[PDB]
């Protein structure tokens, strides 16, 4: 038939993105357990600034989601090529006019620029209306990242619920967290605060917390807790205030979808997913 | 008619709770729904009668919402041939079997999603997180399932005493993944969760391995907060409870979207607060 086009996104520790060496291959490296790190070539734009041309370059990709992709491809016997989403976004539906349009990885899957999304892609109502999700390969939720020393209780802290310009918080544009705060009227006061400060990417948000330019970053707990384990000037506070899972994304008529989900279940059940957690997520403190 | 569905469930507090109906009214009141239970006349006959009972709890609240949101009516009944689901000589019993053999359009209850069940039924998205946890008395030093006290029990004298409640997704998992542990464990099989908690509290069992959502609840409710799950409530083989439907069911899409809407709009947290809270 054809090799599957996989779209993914930069998001440590699920997807690392690094330059190739001079000869165009990826450097040999070894995990915390001594095992070789499986890397794939992934093409992506080098200019990521908004409104600029997106001409692509071969790069190296690896991490929890890349190991999961490799396991899927071996299990179900497909070949694949990987690229990074062109606009850098996870994907929301926005009004154009009366038409609506999906951006990010959702937009690429729906348009056929991608055949499968392999990424820390949150399962939610809005996307399930359009695409097919696997059963979750990772259970997690939302929490709040802050500079160490900053004291806030959680989602109900008055500096979040009765906001002012003195304490700035934000999430990632065109992400599932964006959708979440826009969807719920009870959260509308926080939504309107965040829409002035949302960041193009998680890594940019995290760095803005380190630089005391963002006071709180609301984002996925699997990601924020990993960051807090490596950068000891950053912490999470408040524990999970909403729970959600990551799933593989496919078009509703993919022939692969039943066997993808069964493989995810199998991998939870035989300890493979735990192994991935020990390798990529839970190993420092 | 085509909008009126046979649905099956199973008592497992607090997710499904079964009460007797008021004999003076024969009407379920308050926050309960009618659910019937086929009860045998004797053990030398196949005769039975359907007994009118009343059902409530966390998964019953989920069912009422689904019934309102997706627009269906139902006749809820309690399974009597097994419990959650087990394959015996290639024949499924429990709630799974009711669905496989088309006696029910869906199973709503504390029904764990796993691979071998997904080969014979379609599952909704998970609506409650679960998996496998370990309950102990506080301070018991056990890292988890892979702890050597579990994997190589006779490497200790006296050996660790630990069991599960047989025939559900927990035992199936342990049998497949840890053969020596499984064959050791069977002598500590517990008839149900209430027996297991008594065995723990009285020193007849050192550990109880079972469904994480139920164990974490029992921990939060334990009198005196003596029984805990290890790792601050750690879950091995993370999965969830799912609604089970017939393969190819045309209700699946709307059920999935409904559950995801409930989650997205915070409605699921209200149910969690209502049914799943304890003072530990
Ligand atoms: O975990 C078990 O072994 C039994 C069990 C207990 C609570 C919820 N579900 C199940 C199930 O097998 O679906």
Q: Is B238 on the interface with A (CB under 8 A)?
A: yes
Q: Verify that A19 and A148 share a domain, yes or no.
A: no
Going by alpha carbons, the residue nearest to atom 8 of ligand 1 is: B110
Residue B268, domain CATH:
3.40.190.10
- Given a contact cutoff of 8 angstroms between Cβ atoms, the answer to whether A113 and A241 are in contact is no
C-alpha to C-alpha distance for A180 and B224, rounded to whole angstroms: 39
Residue with tokens 């990826």: A26
SS (H, E, C) B40-100: ECCCCCCCEEEEEEEEECHHHHHHHHHHHHHHCEEEEEECCCCCCCCEECCEECHHHHHHH
Count residue pairs from A and B with Cβ separation < 8 A: 71
Q: Verify that A253 and A121 share a domain, yes or no.
A: yes
Q: Verify that A108 and A127 share a domain, yes or no.
A: yes
* Residue B22 DSSP SS3: coil
For residue B175, count CB atoms less than 10 angstroms from its CB and return exposed for 0-12, middle for 13-18, buried for 19 or more.
middle
Q: Verify that A22 and A107 share a domain, yes or no.
A: yes
Interchain pair A271, B237: CB under 8 A: yes
Q: Verify that B153 and B126 share a domain, yes or no.
A: no
Work out the angle at residue A116's Cα, subtended by the Cα atoms of residues A111 and A122, and round it to the nearest 5 degrees. Answer: 95
| Elucidated via | X-ray
For residue A46, count CB atoms less than 10 angstroms from its CB and return exposed for 0-12, middle for 13-18, buried for 19 or more.
exposed
Q: Verify that B1 and B99 share a domain, yes or no.
A: yes
Q: Is B257 on the interface with A (CB under 8 A)?
A: yes
Q: What is the DSSP secondary structure assignment for residue A27, as one 8-state letter?
A: P
Q: Verify that A99 and A192 share a domain, yes or no.
A: no
Q: Verify that A12 and A125 share a domain, yes or no.
A: yes
Other C-beta atoms closer than 10 Å to the C-beta of A122 total 24
Q: Verify that B169 and B260 share a domain, yes or no.
A: no
Interchain pair A245, B126: CB under 8 A: yes
Other C-beta atoms closer than 10 Å to the C-beta of B151 total 13
Interchain pair A270, B176: CB under 8 A: yes
Domain residue limits at B203: 131-237
Give which of B184, B180, B186, B144 is closest to B165, Cα–Cα: B186
Q: Verify that A88 and A151 share a domain, yes or no.
A: no
Q: Verify that B111 and B242 share a domain, yes or no.
A: yes
Best of A125, A244, A272 to mutate (most B CBs within 10 Å, chain B): A125
Q: Per the structure, how many domains does chain B have?
A: 2
Interchain pair A184, B237: CB under 8 A: no
Q: Is the CB of B110 under 6 A from ligand 1?
A: yes
Nearest chain B residue (CA) to A138 = B238
- Residue B163: φ, ψ to 5°: -150, 180
Give which of A38, A269, A3, A282 is closest to A135, Cα–Cα: A269
C-alpha to C-alpha distance for A109 and A236, rounded to whole angstroms: 33
For residue B26, count CB atoms less than 10 angstroms from its CB and return exposed for 0-12, middle for 13-18, buried for 19 or more.
exposed
- Given a contact cutoff of 8 angstroms between Cβ atoms, the answer to whether B238 and B144 are in contact is no
Q: Is the CB of B168 under 6 A from ligand 1?
A: yes
C-alpha to C-alpha distance for B215 and B197, rounded to whole angstroms: 10
Helix axes B58-66, B252-264, angle to 10 degrees: 120
C-alpha to C-alpha distance for A234 and A225, rounded to whole angstroms: 10
Q: What is the DSSP secondary structure assignment for residue A15, as one 8-state letter?
A: B
Q: Say whether B112 counts as a known binding-site residue.
A: yes
Distance from CA of A224 to the nearest CA of B (A): 19
Domain residue limits at A17: 3-139+248-283
C-alpha to C-alpha distance for B239 and B126, rounded to whole angstroms: 7
Residue A241, domain CATH:
3.40.190.10
Q: Per the structure, how many domains does chain A have?
A: 2
C-alpha to C-alpha distance for A238 and A82, rounded to whole angstroms: 36
Minimal Cβ distance to B237: which of A184, A186, A268 = A268
Q: Verify that A102 and A174 share a domain, yes or no.
A: no
Q: Residue B128 C-alpha to ligand 1 middle, in angstroms? A: 13
Residue A142 neighbours by CB under 8 Å, 6+ apart: A177, A180, A218, A219, A220, A221, A240, A241, A242, A244
Ligand 1 atom with minimal separation from the B12 CA: 7
Q: Is the CB of B214 under 6 A from ligand 1?
A: yes
Q: Verify that A159 and A273 share a domain, yes or no.
A: no
Gyration radius of chain B over CA positions: 19
Q: Verify that A96 and A170 share a domain, yes or no.
A: no
Interchain pair A265, B114: CB under 8 A: yes
* Pair of tokens at residue B161: 């005493």
Q: Are strands B17-20 and B48-56 parallel, antiparallel or unpaired?
A: antiparallel
């Amino acid at each position: 038939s054809t090799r599957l086009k996989i779209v993914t996104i930069h998001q440590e520790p699920f997807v690392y993105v690094k330059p190739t060496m001079s000869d165009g291959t990826c450097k040999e490296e070894f995990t915390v357990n001594g095992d070789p790190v499986k890397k794939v070539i992934c093409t992506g734009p080098n200019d990521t600034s908004p409104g600029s041309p997106r001409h692509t370059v071969p790069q190296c990709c690896y991490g929890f989601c890349i190991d999961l992709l490799i396991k899927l491809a071996r299990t179900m016997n497909f070949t694949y090529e990987v690229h990074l989403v062109a606009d850098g976004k996870f994907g929301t539906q926005e009004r154009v006019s009366n038409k609506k349009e999906w951006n990010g990885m959702m937009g690429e899957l729906l348009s056929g620029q991608a055949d499968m999304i392999v990424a820390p892609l949150t399962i939610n109502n809005e996307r399930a209306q359009y695409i097919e999700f696997s059963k979750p390969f990772k259970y997690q939720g939302l929490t709040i990242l802050v500079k160490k020393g900053t004291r806030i209780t959680g989602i109900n802290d008055p500096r979040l619920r009765n906001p002012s310009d003195k304490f700035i918080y934000a999430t990632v544009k065109q992400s599932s967290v964006d959708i979440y705060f826009r969807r719920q009227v009870e959260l509308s006061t926080m939504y309107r605060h965040m829409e002035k400060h949302n960041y193009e990417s998680a890594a940019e948000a995290i760095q803005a917390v380190r630089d005391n330019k963002l006071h709180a970053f609301i984002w996925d707990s699997a990601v924020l807790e990993f960051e807090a384990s490596q950068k000891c000037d950053l912490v999470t506070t408040g524990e999970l205030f909403f729970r959600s899972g990551f799933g593989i994304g496919m078009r509703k008529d993919s022939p692969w979808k039943q066997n993808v989900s069964l493989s995810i279940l199998k991998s939870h059940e035989n300890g493979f997913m735990e192994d991935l957690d020990k390798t990529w997520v839970r190993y420092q403190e | 008619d085509d909008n009126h569905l046979s649905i099956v469930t199973l008592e497992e507090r607090p997710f499904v709770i079964v009460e007797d109906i008021d004999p003076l009214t024969e009407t379920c009141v308050r926050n309960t729904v009618p659910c019937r239970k086929f009860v045998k006349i004797n053990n030398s006959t196949n005769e039975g009668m359907n007994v009118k009972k009343c059902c409530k709890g966390f998964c019953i609240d989920i069912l009422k919402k689904l019934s309102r949101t997706v627009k269906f009516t139902y006749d809820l009944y309690l399974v009597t041939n097994g419990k959650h689901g087990k394959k015996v000589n290639n024949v499924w019993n429990g709630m799974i079997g009711e669905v496989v053999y088309q006696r029910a359009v869906m199973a709503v209850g504390s029904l764990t999603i796993n691979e071998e069940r997904s080969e014979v039924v379609d599952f909704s998205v998970p609506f409650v997180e679960t998996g496998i946890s370990v309950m102990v008395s506080r301070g018991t030093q056990v890292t988890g399932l892979s702890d050597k006290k579990f994997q190589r029990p006779h490497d200790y004298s006296p050996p660790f005493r630990f069991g599960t409640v047989p025939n559900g997704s927990t035992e199936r998992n342990i049998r497949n993944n840890y053969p020596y542990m499984h064959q050791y464990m069977t002598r500590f099989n517990q008839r149900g969760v209430e027996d297991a908690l008594v065995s723990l509290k009285t020193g007849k069992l050192d550990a109880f391995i079972y469904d994480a959502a139920v164990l974490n609840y029992m921990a939060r409710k334990d009198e005196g907060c003596k029984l805990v799950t290890i790792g601050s409530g750690y879950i091995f083989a993370t999965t969830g409870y799912g609604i089970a439907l017939q393969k190819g069911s045309p209700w699946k899409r709307q059920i999935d979207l409904a559950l995801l809407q409930f989650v997205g709009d915070g409605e699921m947290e209200e149910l969690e607060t209502l049914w799943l809270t304890g003072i530990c």
